[PDB]
Amino acid sequence: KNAEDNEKKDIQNIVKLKVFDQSIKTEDFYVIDVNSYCKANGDYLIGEFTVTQFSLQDGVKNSYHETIIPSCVPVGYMFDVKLGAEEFGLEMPGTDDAGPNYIQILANIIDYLKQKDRTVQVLPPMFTLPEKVDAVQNFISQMCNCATEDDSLFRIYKLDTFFFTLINAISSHHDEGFPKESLALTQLTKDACERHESLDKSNVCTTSRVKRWVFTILDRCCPLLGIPLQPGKHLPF
Ligand SMILES: [Zn+2]
């Protein structure tokens, strides 16, 4: 994990400089979460994901959400597929074979991440809770075969490490922030989409899941910079 120090030095590198050049309130950061039906044949059977864009100043700008109904159930994994569908409110495989547009989806993602007026071939990170890293890297990898494309394009980084570093760099007073990284995971553990809102919960929604993550970090990070937590932007409504 000598390369997970790299992830750590990467996350610091981004954050320190953007506060160092006094632009951190407006920089755009990206969070991702996924739902998996099951984990079939070495790969995760992805059923939903959301990538959402926020800045400290404006809060959540928007998000990119899709529900994925694979054509079919892997053989050997019916119970497993039914369980996740069950947990996550996902529909079962094969509905008109309104099939996974994976060639397209990498490209919608790649369009979503791309920075206005950047002069390098480099996409922002997406940050997710530590548990969801294997799933979300796998998803990314699955798509890169349907286009011969590469993993390396993407950095799939841990959100707690982000919260920790962002807050502690914008902290000023000693009373502010997290002494240990633990507190961040712990705070993101402390605290939708139309279908799920139609399914009452709308609690296992990756749009939901991902949005509650950002609200707590905005919650602790915004006032350190004197930013009103506007509802429907930093707060709900
Ligand atoms: Zn949803």
Author numbering: 90 to 280, 289 to 334
Sentences from the paper on this structure:
Piwi-interacting RNAs (piRNAs) guide Piwi argonautes to their transposon targets for silencing. The highly conserved protein Maelstrom is linked to both piRNA biogenesis and effector roles in this pathway. Our studies suggest that the ancient MAEL nuclease domain evolved to function as an RNA-binding module in metazoan Maelstrom.
This reveals an α/β structure composed of an amino-terminal linker helix followed by the MAEL domain. The MAEL domain is composed of a central β-sheet composed of five strands (β1–β5), where β2 is antiparallel to the others. The β-sheet is flanked on one face by three helices (α8–α10) and on the other by two helices (α6 and α7). Despite this overall resemblance between MAEL and DEDD nuclease domains, one striking difference is the presence of a Zn2+ ion in the MAEL structure that bridges the bottom of the β-sheet and the loop connecting α9 and α10, which encompasses η2. The Zn2+ ion is tetrahedrally coordinated by E137 from β2, H293 from η2, and residues C290 and C302 from loops. The fact that the Zn2+ ion was captured from the bacterial culture media, and not added during initial crystallization trials, points to its paramount importance for the structural integrity of the MAEL domain. A closer comparison of the Bombyx MAEL domain with the DEDD nuclease domain in E. coli Pol III reveals that the catalytic residues (D12, E14, D103, and D167) essential for coordinating two Mn2+ ions in the bacterial enzyme are not conserved in the MAEL domain.
